[PDB]
Amino acid sequence: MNHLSQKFAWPKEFLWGSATAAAQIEGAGHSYGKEDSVWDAFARKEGAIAGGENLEVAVDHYHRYREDVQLMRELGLDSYRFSTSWARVVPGGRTVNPEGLDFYSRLVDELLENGILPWLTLYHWDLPQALEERGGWTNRETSYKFLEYAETVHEKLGDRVKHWTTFNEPLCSSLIGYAAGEHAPGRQEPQAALAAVHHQHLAHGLATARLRELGAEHIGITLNLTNAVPNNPGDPVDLEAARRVDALWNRMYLDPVLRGSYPEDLLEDVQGLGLAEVIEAGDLEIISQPIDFLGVNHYHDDNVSGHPLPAGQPQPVVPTDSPKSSPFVGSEYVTFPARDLPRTAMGWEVNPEGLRVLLNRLNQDYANLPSLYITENGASYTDTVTEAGTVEDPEREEYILNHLDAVVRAIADGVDVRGYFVWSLLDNFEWAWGYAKRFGIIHVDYQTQVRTIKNSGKAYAGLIAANRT
């Protein structure tokens, strides 16, 4: 039997895509002028990345983009979401690199020539390391360097690319990279994290305004959003913990963009932890530029408690055993007890209806929410290539169709969702987890670089084809 998503008559102008990030697929890590990103430097630190792996080669998209574009076309995608690497475009934060801009220009041409709409993200975590040595996102100047970087890329691609995203998942590059220590640059400093939160916001606002001036047609930002579900809704300790999580994960990023303010309860929670100190007059006005779309990334929601974990509990699944901290600045006491739900190979719970809940809440609580796109959704399960040369990944396929079902129901609930991008087009470097955690609808043999469309990829193409003529 087929899923709702496989039988639904989707809107004709609904946008079907797939997504990647530069650092995760490009390779050519130190060729053609590219120099260290914060991730290249981080990957030299012991314990940083599973298996001691790095970003030098990845799936070598830099040399295979033409053929990866042909795969997009064989899938029948409407659009391709990718990022440009700051570490490649302005190596070391010094001089612009024309070889780097030229690659992106050649990519964009391949896309357009094959009828595929480029959806560009400016920042997907690859700050040049040299700028981190000057404080990275703790340093206010970095926001203004990003502004110049944004203009530099738009000068080159603005004649052809109409869809511009400033940041992908700012929560990750701020909290998880400066507080939790799991992500580059691997710091564990609450004050540094909150500084990063604000300066990314400021960078977003500066760049949105400038890109608008330069005529960019659709400008937005992509956030990984969640539902903070209290483990026991009858327990004020859990409700408080859920509030604090909702504030940090969702509202600290949504409100300054859409409301021109940090939430009052959030500001109280992180009092004296370094957010107020970096806020200057006019900053929030700058941050809250109008955006034409909000990209939603969502893999699962969160079950929150304010109590210590109960004893019947599955071990945490972590990419390495390096010492790490809670990303929940000011609320590190909160915990996340297990729910009776299946999990992916990364230990992530699977709760498709949570997507529907999230979309509905956004729709109800933000009066002038822009149009929504699901800019990332996917799952990592272990893959093997059969002797017949196929990849049978029914659990990944099931995850995708089930979450597409939730989208359908969200649309029927009245939510304005206009597109969906599966993460990821290609198996790739999953950050601290390294290459063992595959997300692709397209398999990559890391020994030969050969791509193989997985069964989930074929199922996805088949769904699109039934909705495209």
CATH number at residue 245: 3.20.20.80
**Ligand-binding site membership of 3 (annotated):** no
Token duo for residue 380: 């990592």
Method: X-ray
**Ligand-binding site membership of 124 (annotated):** yes
d(CA 113, CA 69) in angstroms, rounded, equals 10
Q: Which of 417, 407, 389, 410 lies closest to 463 in space, CA to CA?
A: 407
Number of structural domains in the chain: 1
CB 81 within 8 A of CB 22: no
**Which residues make Cβ contacts (< 8 Å) with residue 197, sequence separation at least 6?**
170, 174, 175, 252, 253, 275
**Ligand-binding site membership of 39 (annotated):** no
d(CA 272, CA 276) in angstroms, rounded, equals 8
Catalytic residue among 53, 110, 376, 395: 376
- Residues present in the chain in total: 469
Range of the domain at 251: 1-469
Q: Catalytic residue at 189? A: no
Q: Catalytic residue at 376? A: yes
Q: Which pairing describes strands 371-377 and 293-297: parallel, antiparallel, or unpaired? A: parallel
CA distance to 17, 40, 186, 223, per residue, from 354 (Å): 21, 35, 30, 16
d(CA 284, CA 260) in angstroms, rounded, equals 5
Catalytic residue among 35, 169, 349, 398: 169
**Ligand-binding site membership of 137 (annotated):** no
CA distance to 115, 308, 314, 392, per residue, from 343 (Å): 36, 22, 11, 18
Q: Tell how far CA 306 is from the center of its chain.
A: 27
d(CA 397, CA 401) in angstroms, rounded, equals 6
Q: Which residues pair with 347 in a beta bridge?
A: none
On the CB side of 306, CA atoms within 13 Å amount to 17
